Each structure stands twice: as C-alpha cells, then as structure tokens.
Design a binder for this molecule. Sequence first.
Ligand SMILES: CC(=O)N[C@H]1[C@H]([C@H](O)[C@H](O)CO)O[C@@](O[C@H]2[C@@H](O)[C@@H](CO)O[C@@H](O[C@H]3[C@H](O)[C@@H](O)[C@H](O)O[C@@H]3CO)[C@@H]2O)(C(=O)O)C[C@@H]1O
Lengths: 256, 265, 265, 259, 259
Amino acid sequence: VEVLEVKTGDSITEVECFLTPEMGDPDEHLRGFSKSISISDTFESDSPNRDMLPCYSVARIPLPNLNLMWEAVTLKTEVIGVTSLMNVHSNGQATHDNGAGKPVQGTSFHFFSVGGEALELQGVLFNYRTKYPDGTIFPKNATVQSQVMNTEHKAYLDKNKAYPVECWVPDPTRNENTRYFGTLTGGENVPPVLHITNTATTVLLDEFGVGPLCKGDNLYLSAVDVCGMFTNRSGSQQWRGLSRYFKVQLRKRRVK
Amino acid sequence: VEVLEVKTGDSITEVECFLTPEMGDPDEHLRGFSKSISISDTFESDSPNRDMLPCYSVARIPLPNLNEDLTCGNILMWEAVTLKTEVIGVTSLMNVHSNGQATHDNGAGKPVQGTSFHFFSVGGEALELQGVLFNYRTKYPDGTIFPKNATVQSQVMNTEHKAYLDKNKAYPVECWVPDPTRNENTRYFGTLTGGENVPPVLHITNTATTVLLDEFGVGPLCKGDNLYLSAVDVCGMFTNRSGSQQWRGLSRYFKVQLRKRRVKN
Amino acid sequence: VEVLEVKTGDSITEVECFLTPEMGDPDEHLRGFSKSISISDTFESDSPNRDMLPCYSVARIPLPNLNEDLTCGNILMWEAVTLKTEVIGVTSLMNVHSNGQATHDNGAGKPVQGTSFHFFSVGGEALELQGVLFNYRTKYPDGTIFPKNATVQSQVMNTEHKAYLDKNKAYPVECWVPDPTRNENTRYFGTLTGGENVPPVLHITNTATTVLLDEFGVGPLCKGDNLYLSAVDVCGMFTNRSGSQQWRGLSRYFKVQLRKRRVKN
Amino acid sequence: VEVLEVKTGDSITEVECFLTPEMGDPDEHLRGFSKSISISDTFESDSPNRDMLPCYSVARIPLPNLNNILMWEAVTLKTEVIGVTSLMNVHSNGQATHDNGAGKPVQGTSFHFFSVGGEALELQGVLFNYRTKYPDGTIFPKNATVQSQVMNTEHKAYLDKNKAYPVECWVPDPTRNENTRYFGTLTGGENVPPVLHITNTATTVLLDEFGVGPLCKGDNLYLSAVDVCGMFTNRSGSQQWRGLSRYFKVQLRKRRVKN
Amino acid sequence: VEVLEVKTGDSITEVECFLTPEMGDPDEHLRGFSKSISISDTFESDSPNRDMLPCYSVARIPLPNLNNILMWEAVTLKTEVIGVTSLMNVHSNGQATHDNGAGKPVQGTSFHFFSVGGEALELQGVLFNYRTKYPDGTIFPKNATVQSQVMNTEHKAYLDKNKAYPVECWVPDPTRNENTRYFGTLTGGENVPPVLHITNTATTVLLDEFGVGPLCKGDNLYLSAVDVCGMFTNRSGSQQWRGLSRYFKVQLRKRRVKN
Ligand SMILES: CC(=O)N[C@H]1[C@H]([C@H](O)[C@H](O)CO)O[C@@](O[C@H]2[C@@H](O)[C@@H](CO)O[C@@H](O[C@H]3[C@H](O)[C@@H](O)[C@H](O)O[C@@H]3CO)[C@@H]2O)(C(=O)O)C[C@@H]1O
C-alpha cells in the first residue's frame, strides 16, 4: 500500500465502545472473576481448567463502507469501574482480627491495542508441559524451547474468550498495522494503581504520520485488564478483571 | 452549541470553596470517618450499612447571572479555564496517639493507610456516572442511590446503570465511576490505589494550576450559570486498638477561574 | 499593590540561612527528637504531651531597609525570585548502631522510617494556616497554639480555625496546614508520606533552583522588608530497643535571591 | 576514524532478531530457568555450579558487505522482553502464598540489560566474593584478589561467546565501549515485583552527542542482553532464576569514514 | 574571579578514573565491606569501631599546567556505579529468605553521592547522636553539643583525606561549595531494594545558571563519592555495609579569568 493524502471535509468518524473482561466466569454469578486457583504438584501435571484462565478480549468493529481506507488517528481509553475494588466487606479474608477484608491485589496485566487487522500473537509458555484445556487456543507442538522462544507459535487474536493471557503476547516481529501497549506488574502483594481521566489522548500515528489502516473497513480493539486477585475468607484466590473503554477517531486516507 | 469569542474587559470571575468528605459519619463525633467495616458471612449476603459506605461529594455553585436582557441568537456562558486543587488537612494523619493499634509492643499507632481513592471534577453540569458492582448480589442500603435491577453483567458492564451526581452523601463510591461515554462538558481526574498497606502520598502546593480547556481551547460551559464541583478523598483506613477499621476522608479545596464566552444557540 | 518595573543596577540581595527542626526535644540530650509516642486508652481521651508534638519552624529575616525617603504614590519592595533548599544531615540516618531495636536476630538497628512530612514556604508575610483535627476531642497541651472551640466539624473543615505561623515551637504539625484560601503572597510546597514502614528518600544537590514567580511573573513581595521562611522535616520515627518510637527531624537550608520591585501603593 | 557524510537513497538496512536468555538450563525440561540456588556454608567455600549461573546473551549479526571506506551505522533500536504474560502462571508447582492461595509469582532481584555496538561489548570484572570458585565452562575473572571485590583493572574481557560470561562476575566496562550503546537496571530484593512494559511505539536513538551511532567493524553488528526477571519459588521453597527472550530491531545507514 | 571568554581550538582535556569505596575493610578478605554492625545499649555508650564506619572517597586529579590567568573549567560528567551485577551473588554464606530459599540479597539503607569541584568538597557536620565516640583514625565533628544533632556551625571541614571522614557524621555544606556540583540520595529503610541504572549514553552538564562550571584552582580537579549499596546479611543474621566503585569521566575546557 502506497499511502497518499488525507480526505478533508464526512471525512471523519468515531468508534466508542467497551470491551468486557474474560477472566473465566466459573458460574452464572461470577462474570469478571476466574475460578479459584489450584496449584499442580509437578510441572508435568500442570492442567489449568478453562474457567481458571484469563483470556484476551477482542472486538472487530465494522466502519462505514468506503469503496479510501479508515485511518485510526487518536485513542482515549480507561478502565471502567475502578472504585468497585473498594468493596472490602463481601466475605473476604480479614487482614487481622476485627479488620476489613484484604482488597484485590497481586499480579496485574493491563493491555490495549488498536489496529486495522487482528493483533498478531507469539506464544511463550512458563512451562511447556502445561496441558491447556479444550475450548482455548494455545501454543501447539510445544517443546522445552517454547519456554523462551519457539517461532512455530504464531496466531491471530481472532476469537474472544479463547486465547489465554499466560501463553500469548503481541508478536514484536509483526503488528506493523497495530499500536499496542501493556504492563505486567508481578507479585502477590502488588497494589492496583488505576488512573481515570477524560483529558488524556494517545496519538496512534507512526514516525511517518500514518495510523493503523482498517482492512475491509474493520477496526480491531484488544484488551486485558487483570486487576489482581480477590482473596475469599477461605484463602482461595480468583483473578478479578474490569471492562475497558475505547474512543477512536478515524479519518479517510487514500492509498494506491 | 457553537462556541464564538471570549468577552474581555467584569469578563472574568473566580470560585473558591471546599468540599467536605462523605465517609458515612456513623455518630455525632465521627465526621470524616465511616462506621467500622464488617465482613458478610457469605459472598451472596454482602449487605453494607449506609454509614459504612463513603459517597461522592458534590457542590453546585451559582455564578454571576448572565443574559438578564433578551438576546437574539446568542447568549454568554461562564467557561471554566483553570483549576487549583488541594487535599486540606494532610498533616492530621500524623496523629498516631489517639487509641490506635500499636505497630509493635510499645510502638506508636499504625497510621491511616490502605486503599485510597482521590478524585475531582469540574463541569458545567452534573458529573455523569456509570455503575459497576464488585458483587451484583450486594444489598445496598436505604438512603443510598445505587445501580438498580443489578444482574451478573453489572459486575463488568451493564449500560442500564446511568446516573447524575446530583445529590450529596447519596452515591456510594464503590458503585459508581465517571461515565467515559458522556461527560463532554466536565473534566475529571481520579486515582485508585488498592492494598491494606498502601501508604498515603499527599502533595500540597499553591503553585500548581490545571488547564481545563479541551483540544479545541474550550473549557466546561456552565449551563444556567451553575458550576459543578465533585470530589472523593478516601485517604485510607484508621485501625482502632481493637483492630476494627474505618475509612478516613479529608476535604478538598477548589479554585476555578472562569471567563465569559459567547455561544450561538 | 499594582506591580510596576524591576529596579536594575544594590538592586539584588540574597538571604542564606537554616531552620532547625522543632520535634519536641524531651531532654537535654534529644534535640531533633520527640518524646516517645504514647497511645491514649480511649479515642476521646487523646491528650498528647507538648514534647511529643512536632511543630512548624519559622524564621523572619530582615532585608535591607527600603523607602528611607518620602515617596509619592509608589514604594520599592523586595521580590523573592528563586529558592535553593536542602535537608541538612541526611547521612546521620545511617547511624543504626546505637540504642535501637535489631531488625532481626544479630541484625543492625532499625533505621528512621515511617510517616514523614517535608514542607517549606517562602513568603512576604507569615504563612497563613487552616486548622484540621484528626480527632476534635484531642486535648492539646499548654504552650502550643492549636485550633480552639473545636467541634466535630473541625475533623473535616471548620473555617473558624485561621492562624498565622508567627511563633516557633508553637504550632503543632498535626493541627495545621497552609490555608489554600489565602497565601497569595507565599509559595508553599509539602509532601506527607504515611505508613509505619515507609523508607525515607532524601535528595541533596546544589544544582536545583525553584522559581518563585506566579503566572504574572511576580514573586512574594516582602512587607516591611521582612522575608518569612517556614519548614517541617519530620523524617520518620526512631525505634528504641524497647519498641518505643520518637519522631526525628532535620534542619533545612534556604537560599533566596530577591530583587527590588516598584509598586503603586 | 574521521566520520564523513551519510549515504542517502540502497543506503539503509534493518536487523530484526531475538536473543534467548541463558539462565543455566539445569535439565531437558527447564530451558529459561537456572538450577535451584544453594548457599555455601562460608565465603571461602562459595562454589556455584555452571547451571546455577545466568550468563550474558550475545549475537554477532553479519551485515551486507560494503567494501576511505563505508561502514554501517546503527541509528535506532526498538526492543521488547518477549513473553511477559508467562509470569501469570501461578498454578504450576509454585509455593502457595498462604493456605489455599495461588502460587507465588516470579519476583525478587532482576537485571534487565541490552546493548547495540559496532564490536563486542567490553566487560570489566567485579566479584561479590573474590574467593568464589567459578565453574569449568564459564569465563570469569582470573587471578582474583581481594581488590577484585571493588576494582581490579586486570579483569578485562570481550562478550565474545554465548552461555559463557556469568552475569554476577561482569559489567559493561565504562572506561571503554565508545562504539556501543548500553542500558541496564539492577533491581535488588527478594520480594521486588517485576514491572515489564511492552509496546511497538517506542524507539531509542543510538546517535551520540556528535550525531554518530555505533559503526560496524567488519560489517558485524553486536547485540547483547540479560533479562533475569526474578526468581521462581517452587512448592518446596527452592528458588530458580527465570529469564525471557529479548526482541531487537535496529535500523542502520551507510556512513563514509576515513580510517 | 571575574570570568571572561572560553578558549577555542588545544583548549579541551578529559579526566577518566574510578574511586574505590571505603566501607571499613575489616580484614584482608573483605575489601568493599564494613565490619559487622553492632548496637550500643545507649546513645551515651555509642563507640563505633573504625572498621564499621563507611567513609567518603576523594581523589585530587592534577590537570595540565596552564600558567589574567587560564583555568580548567569542568563542563560535563558521565558517572556510573561499577559492578552492579555482583549483587546477584545470593549463594555465598547468605541467610536463606525461607526454608530451602536463596540468600537474602543486599538491601536496606543506601547512600549514593558524587561531586565534581575545582577545590575540596566543603563539609558540614550533623550527628545522629552527639554523644557518639568516633574512633582514632577518623576525622569527625569536634566539641559536639546537643545542638550538633540539628545544626552546629562549628563543624566545618574539607574532604581532604581518604578513609577518614565517616559518611554518617558529614554532609556537603550547602552554605558553601559555590565551586563544586554535588548530587546525593539517601534511601532509608531496613528492606529497601537497590535500584541501580547503568548506561554510557547519559551526560550531566556542570555549568551553573551563568554558564560557568567548576574552575580548577591550581589545575586540580576534585572528585568525591559514596556508594553504600545496602547491607549484606550473613547466615548468622549479622549485617555488613557493601559498597561499589564509581566511574567518572569529566570534560574540561580552558577559561580566561581576572584575579
Ligand atoms: C467470589 C466467590 O464466589 N467466592 C466463593 C468461592 C468461589 O465461588 C470459588 O472458589 C470459585 O471457583 O468459593 C468458596 O467455596 C465454596 C465453593 O467451594 C462451593 C462450590 O459449590 O462450595 C462451598 O461450600 C459448600 C459445600 O461444598 C456444601 O457441602 C455445603 O452444603 O454448602 C457449602 C456452602 O455453600 C464453598 O464455600 C471458596 O472459598 O473458594 C466460597 C467463596 O465465598
């Protein structure tokens, strides 16, 4: 694609939506939570249940039909419902005798991307002998080299509630037509730090002034917002996730 | 709807006030504190008492009346340009001698610490809220305004839960956030820091100004010559000698500079 | 005053000094420390001893006398333009080898840590204070200047509690903050870092300058040719072998550059 | 070398690759992990096994042959740690953080380091303990003395072999490395949380204060990395270093020089 | 001094060196470490062993002889802590963090400090405890009173000797040092983790707000450092300060001055 001039004047459109989190939803009451975590006694017996595995969120958003391509230029984003983590009274584990419940805390992954095609993924496994469950899409034909880098494990984020967070990352060797951003903060005691504001804009243009170009007039939004773990009275722990807001401004760009 | 020129020359005004916190105030002695926190026996039976729930603070400030004479196709509106804001009384959290829980044998009292939410907004109309529930089966108490007709989808995003921050001491902090799909005429800023051992970090200065203009150079436009200020400043929890814990909040200072803007109807 | 031009060409002067901390000084050996903290048996019986309460530091520095001759409609005032400031003696906190509680079996002494308040201001008049009480039923001791006629409102915001920082070793840190509704002719800066285990982080350099000019390019204007410097540097608590804890403070260095400004009075 | 003009137009090339971590690989199932850490009874008896010692990673990348000569000049770097989300596996023979809890995540001491140069990274040896016996198959500071615990200028080496130079023995030599750009952070402590950022939007410029990047001697580019993310604690309490791969994309341009 | 024009053209020189740390060196095997830290029962009985007290490091570096006179002006600094990766040795006579765990890494109170001046660093004495008896072989605040715990203006000195000025009783005097640039950070706490960054891409400019750097009196450059990284905990629980060397590269230029 040779990228030519931006159209001016009906030349702009805006996408506004939320992506709900996919933490595992172990029953009809627990949308936004995983199953409580259980630990294998060996690497060879690691066999996580599907409802215990957070997955990447993805939305494919149809744009007004053009034939010109829609170019994504700016992003406003934030995590929705941050104050829900102040619920320290719902059968949690008292931090000490007569105390409030331990708040959601521990390992977090906050990730979002905007692209003109599916996010491209590279698989990396903590433990190559993990048995990933039916109904997930995971690195296949894993070897011990999969624990550091096995170039066989290439995939597209092309299905919601399917690609487990722990076995996939954005492929840095691809994603020319996507902008992605993420932070992993690890540790059982890590405090959530979540900022909200409607005054912050991210520019999606690359060093040549070109944003993601939407193939087939489709915009791809992807997210993970694992906020940490909720600790039950019993000590059992569940991942807790929150929805992500996206507002994307697009303009019409001529290409050859 | 169409923004035209700024008026120069009585063309500017200043709002200066403080918003007190609404932490629950469980008796006549405990303004600025919640009731001690109680944990439900089951997840399903979560039922927080009203005086255990911090709520959003809101003030609506009347500005000098504009458009006292018939005008033709145009009006003036106050436009909020700048904000100075500060948490008031940060040093009160150095009181570690008032029947708190010693950090160790013969030690000082554990200071206020743990989960905090520091939030402020300036708008030309009420802050628009979206409801998100930690637990959709929580029973919220009489006297609060909370997400109604809650479903399991309320735990992640139920678009039915839309509200306006239009009553003080009513909207629980844990139920509601700014609605990012609205609030075109408000500027809002907040930080949640979660964890029982989180240390308060509170900065004060009279030298810091926030500009409220959007990317087109337009600040909030005050409908009916009213300015809406909203805040939450849950600083953490105070731990009593017994181990019981209460939220502790502080007041927020606002100084807003406004100018007269002509707009086309 | 209406501010006119800067005088050029003895048109500039410098103030250099240090303010000692006022942590309570409980005996002839314990300058820079408080009395050990004791916790009241009930919340209502809070009654801290004077030597247990850190206080704000203040110095009023006379400047070269201006306006010795009769002037007509105008005077000169010293205008404070820049500040360099530093906490003095940060390395003293490396003394973990005396009178302390071992971090663990055979370990070094626990260092000074926990709640800190680092605050400084430069003004052309006394720092204006607003009182906020953690507990309105606290009995503040004789020899301190504290919020009087306290009510439950005093726990969040009682506008009766207005004072000037006009006495050393008198205004307890925990009772008072800079009044954000005043202080037009002062620049103030402070950080409260709460929590019992928070680690001191103290930077020193002679390369950092703070500019004291407001958004109109005007610094504090010194009424009667007096400069007011104020500080708090509560670094945290020292822990004795017994577990008893004492606040520890350090001195603050100020270097202020001033210039003569003509004003219409 | 006198550095003259940049060529314009065929004048650019790109290197894209990844460097795998070299954490010790103690068995056929534990690529990316070290051996469990064991502690010596005395300073005198410190004798770490080779599979317990993370090493520097290095790649020598041949560039298109160019030959007053032309040299490839490295101008920009994009870099990323690959597989940050793998650290969310808290269910694979980890130590529960409390009764009925999830497994302890990887945490504690980390070293994240990368360099781009026109020749091998130059190393200086510094030893925690000069009486440590380093194992066969590693390249370590030789003829160590007590001064090796602070600065022994005898300990000079080139990062010229993969899986060989232990991280704990060697640092970039700040007295050399004029033709390399290096960047590293040590975060020390047993409970330190990993903080790992990923984005494809971040570029590092490799030009010095004279506008000159690394110049590739013999048309070879040198990439080096360490990404020790922390320690994995298994159900027994034993701890292993865990590393991840690093992505590099380098843009180069032809520069004329007089040699 | 009236400061006139910078010379251009033979007009520049560079100083490159390292300063070793002086942590106390309690035996012939423990260069870079202090003696184990003990706790006196009272402020009155505080009598630290010389070998337990880290000291400031200083080097006086002669510059090319120059002689209105010319003076060398220090313009830029690159600096680095040398050997940061040595702190990854958690296998040498350490105290396991928990059953079967690795050694507790170096952590706790750190002081990282450096200065570049045209004359000795000017010091001000501040005592934690005015009753501390400083040992023979150290230079310490004399005639101490209880006011020495906050500010006693009698305690003025120059950093004019190695292995002499204990870190804990001296700081740079902010009321002097007009001809020095100094930078330091004290990070307190029992368990604070080291955070140490290395790069050869970072330059500090030493010019003041008038565009003037340190002017070297008698053609001598003064470099000072402290890099107490934290404490090493032994298997017994006993703790020792651990220090590392600091690299300095200073660029200087000739400046004409009057008087
Ligand atoms: C947020 C939340 O739902 N917390 C629950 C968790 C989670 O639902 C679960 O861990 C997610 O995977 O479950 C807790 O335990 C309950 C769970 O094991 C259920 C499963 O049916 O059984 C409950 O005990 C039953 C018991 O099995 C019956 O024999 C008995 O007649 O009734 C008991 C009470 O219903 C467990 O309490 C958990 O701690 O993991 C409870 C949390 O509140």
